[PDB]
From Swiss-Prot, chain B:
Subunit note: Composed of 13 different subunits. Subunits NuoCD, E, F, and G constitute the peripheral sector of the complex.
Annotated binding of [4Fe-4S] cluster, by residue: 54, 57, 60, 101
Protein name, as recorded: NADH-quinone oxidoreductase subunit F
Function: NDH-1 shuttles electrons from NADH, via FMN and iron-sulfur (Fe-S) centers, to quinones in the respiratory chain. The immediate electron acceptor for the enzyme in this species is believed to be ubiquinone. Couples the redox reaction to proton translocation (for every two electrons transferred, four hydrogen ions are translocated across the cytoplasmic membrane), and thus conserves the redox energy in a proton gradient.
Organism of derivation: Escherichia coli (strain K12)
Range covered out of full length: 298 to 441 of 445
Family: Belongs to the complex I 51 kDa subunit family.
Domain of life: Bacteria
């Protein structure tokens, strides 16, 4: 029962489409700009006490490719973030896997609980490293 | 440079052999009969010239071994279709003033005359097509 306020802007909300004072989830997507950052900070303030924030895309996780004068280098500089979903743009399946990775936090409570120390980098490690062969890219 | 039977009845002077496309040199002449394959004869000549390079200048030190390797391919019958046009280019770029001394210009003088007068035996070496690369799986090549 999670209510999502999607603030996806340009070129990252087109994947989300394929996929106030009422939401408990803020899915920040798109490039966060210096000029428009008070809008996201006020929308974050308006929400109620149990907030959750999902950052998706490289432009929201970091500055991404735009290490430039007009772009803030990540939404985590000014708002707390719970889940980070890399990509440019991420996939709808990744959005699904973000909500699945977040219900575990909602059911695990300071919500670290000494159980969130396990990370997908180390958890799926023995899956990923044992891979030997991949399809040749001259075919469809 | 090699000369033919038509180039006899011509006096042994410097400018008379000079106007016939060759040089008078030491004036000691060598006769080639009908049983010597011209490609083998030139390959023997270039092998001597390549190995007698002093090694100072690039178009002699590195150009002449390429000519030797092409002629070895032509003699065995492994020559590729771009090979004869490479021999032509080598002769042009090893001429006078382009190398440090006159060794390299003297080396290409038999080679350019033998292609001019005996192109059919050099063309007989070309029996294989052009391939200097091997296939790599997963990479489609650039098809000319
Ligand atoms: S992360 Fe990539 S796709 Fe998303 S807004 Fe930035 S540049 Fe566009
Ligand atoms: S052309 Fe003369 S100087 Fe140059 S490498 Fe040959 S022998 Fe040496």
């Amino acid at each position: 029962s999670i209510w999502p306020y999607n603030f996806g802007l340009s070129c990252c909300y087109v994947e989300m489409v394929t996929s106030p004072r009422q939401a408990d989830l803020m899915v920040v997507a798109g490039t966060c700009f210096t000029k428009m950052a008070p809008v996201i900070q006020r929308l974050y303030d308006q929400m109620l006490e149990p907030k959750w924030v999902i950052s998706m895309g490289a432009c929201a996780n970091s500055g991404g490719m735009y290490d430039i004068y007009s772009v803030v280098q990540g939404v985590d500089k000014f708002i707390p973030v719970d889940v980070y979903i890399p990509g440019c743009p991420p996939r709808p399946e990744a959005y699904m896997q973000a909500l699945m990775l977040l219900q575990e936090s909602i059911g695990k409570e300071q919500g670290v609980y000494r159980a969130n120390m396990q990370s997908e980098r180390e958890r799926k490690r023995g899956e990923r490293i044992a891979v030997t062969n991949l399809r040749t890219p001259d075919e469809i | 440079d090699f000369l033919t039977e038509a180039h006899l009845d011509l006096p042994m002077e410097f400018e008379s052999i000079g106007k016939a496309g060759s040089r008078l040199g030491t004036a000691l002449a060598m006769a080639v009969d009908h049983e010597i394959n011209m490609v083998s004869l030139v390959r023997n000549l270039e092998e001597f010239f390549a190995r007698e390079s002093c090694g100072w200048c690039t178009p002699c030190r590195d150009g002449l071994p390429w000519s030797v390797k092409i002629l070895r391919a032509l003699e065995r019958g492994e020559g590729q279709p771009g090979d004869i046009e490479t021999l032509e280019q080598l002769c042009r770029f090893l001429g006078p003033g382009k190398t440090f001394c006159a060794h390299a210009p003297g080396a290409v003088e038999p080679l350019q005359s033998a292609i001019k007068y005996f192109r059919e035996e050099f063309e007989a070496g070309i029996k294989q097509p052009f391939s200097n690369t091997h296939l790599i799986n997963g990479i489609q090549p650039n098809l000319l």
